[PDB]
């Protein structure tokens, strides 16, 4: 459902805008969450990531996740079955252990091997109820993640391009980053009305047929 609400949007958008040759010209100076890194170790463990505002997440293969904050002190996790727990990391219950230091891993992996994918200023408060992965999806193309709020990005592995759909002030947004990991943001309202570009477009197209899987 979370999922059918941004493939509405996003099929209304691509099945309403015009052609265009360049992508819009309005485009907008803001943050919010979004994953500059991320690592797949689904074959052992399970999908990290992290976000803007260095949160560290992590999906594991049994359906739970953890997060580490961003003070990397405290940890949030939920059970496959939705139960939520909080402590800090150090202190950590017998039975949470081996995930915390795999949380652990997957932190000092993506700061020490991986960098930011894209200029996106880091978002200094996330305040709402926080962000979990709920689902993602790889095929010979693309990332694709979604998020417990909405926030819906796929990534291209071919030239690190990535397209990152949220909404903000009860408004949807489309960020394009691209092969020099410039971002550019624009209203959706305004790609309906202006278009885009083929090269966007495409990978508007490729990202919906993920999120129909």
Not at 87 to 115: G, R, W
Not at 117 to 126: A, K, R
Not at 166 to 188: G, P
């Amino acid at each position: 459902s979370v999922a059918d609400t941004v493939a509405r949007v996003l099929r209304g958008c691509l099945e309403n805008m015009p052609e265009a040759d360049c992508i819009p010209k309005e485009q907008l100076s803001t943050s919010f969450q979004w994953v500059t890194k991320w690592v797949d170790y689904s074959n052992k463990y399970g999908f990290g990531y992290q976000l803007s505002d260095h949160t560290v997440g992590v999906l594991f293969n049994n359906g739970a996740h953890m997060s580490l904050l961003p003070d990397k002190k405290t940890v949030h996790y939920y059970a496959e079955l939705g139960q939520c727990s909080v402590f800090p990391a150090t202190d950590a219950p017998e039975q949470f252990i081996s995930q915390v230091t795999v949380l652990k891993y997957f932190s000092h992996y993506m700061e020490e091997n991986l960098m930011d994918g894209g200029d996106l200023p880091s978002v200094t408060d996330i305040r709402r109820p926080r962000l979990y992965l709920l689902q993602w999806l790889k095929s010979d193309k693309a990332l694709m993640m979604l998020f417990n709020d909405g926030t819906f990005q796929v990534n291209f592995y071919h030239d690190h391009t990535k397209i990152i759909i949220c909404s903000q002030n009860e408004e949807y947004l489309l960020t394009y980053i691209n092969e020099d990991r410039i971002s550019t943001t624009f209203r959706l309202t305004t790609l309906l009305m202006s278009g885009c570009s083929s090269e966007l477009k495409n990978r508007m197209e490729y990202a919906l047929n993920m999120l129909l899987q």
